[PDB]
From Swiss-Prot:
Inhibited in vitro by GRL-0617. It is a multi-pass membrane protein. Residues 1-167 form the Macro domain. Responsible for the cleavages located at the N-terminus of the replicase polyprotein. Participates together with nsp4 in the assembly of virally-induced cytoplasmic double-membrane vesicles necessary for viral replication. Antagonizes innate immune induction of type I interferon by blocking the phosphorylation, dimerization and subsequent nuclear translocation of host IRF3. Also prevents host NF-kappa-B signaling. In addition, PL-PRO possesses a deubiquitinating/deISGylating activity and processes both 'Lys-48'- and 'Lys-63'-linked polyubiquitin chains from cellular substrates. May form homohexamers. Interacts with N protein. It is found in: Host endoplasmic reticulum membrane. It catalyses: Thiol-dependent hydrolysis of ester, thioester, amide, peptide and isopeptide bonds formed by the C-terminal Gly of ubiquitin (a 76-residue protein attached to proteins as an intracellular targeting signal). It comes from Severe acute respiratory syndrome coronavirus 2. It comes from the Viruses. Coiled coil: none annotated. This is Papain-like protease nsp3. The chain holds residues 1025 to 1191 of 7096 of the full protein.
Length: 167
C-alpha cells in the first residue's frame, strides 16, 4: 500500500491521473519524482522549469555542479539527484526532443531508467514541449516500465484522451 490517491489503474503496474506533478510531489513526498530533463540539466520550462521553481532554484544550483563535475547526460540517460522539498530523490531522465530531431526510439531507453526504482511519480517522457505524441509515450511506458509508476498528466483534455484511447 502507498499514499497515491485518485489514480486510474491502466495495468498491473501503471497508474495515471490528471495532476500538476509539483502539487502531487508536495503532497505525497514520494521516494522518487522523475524530471523531464535535458542533457545540460537546464531546467527552463515544461516539467523541469516547474519542478525547479518549486525548489526555489535549489534543483538548478545542484544540477549546475553535477554538470560541471560530470558533463552532459546522454539522450535516453538519467542521473539521480536530490528531491529537495518535493521527494527524497529526483530521477532526471532525458527523453528525445523531437524539436531537436532526436530519434524517438530513444524513448524506450529513457523509460528503462524507471526500472531501477520500485515506485516513481513521473510525467510522460518526451511529451509536452519535447514534441512527441503523448499517446505513444504512454504506450512505450506501459511496454517498458515494470516497476510501479504513477503518471501525472498536466493537461486535462489530454488526460481524458489518453484514458479513452488506451488499449
Amino acid at each position: 500500500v502507498n499514499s497515491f490517491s485518485g489514480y486510474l489503474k491502466l495495468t498491473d503496474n501503471v497508474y495515471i491521473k490528471n495532476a500538476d506533478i509539483v502539487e502531487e510531489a508536495k503532497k505525497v513526498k514520494p521516494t522518487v519524482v522523475v524530471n523531464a530533463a535535458n542533457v545540460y540539466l537546464k531546467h527552463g520550462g515544461g516539467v523541469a522549469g516547474a519542478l525547479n521553481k518549486a525548489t526555489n532554484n535549489a534543483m538548478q544550483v545542484e544540477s549546475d555542479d553535477y554538470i560541471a563535475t560530470n558533463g552532459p547526460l546522454k539522450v535516453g540517460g538519467s542521473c539521480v539527484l536530490s528531491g529537495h522539498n518535493l521527494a527524497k530523490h529526483c530521477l532526471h531522465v532525458v527523453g528525445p526532443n523531437v524539436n531537436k530531431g532526436e530519434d524517438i526510439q530513444l524513448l524506450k531507453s529513457a523509460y528503462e531508467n524507471f526500472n531501477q526504482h520500485e515506485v516513481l511519480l513521473a510525467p510522460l517522457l518526451s511529451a509536452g514541449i519535447f514534441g512527441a505524441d503523448p499517446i505513444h509515450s504512454l504506450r512505450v511506458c506501459v511496454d517498458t516500465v515494470r516497476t510501479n509508476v504513477y503518471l501525472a498528466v498536466f493537461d486535462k483534455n489530454l488526460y481524458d484522451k489518453l484514458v479513452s484511447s488506451f488499449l
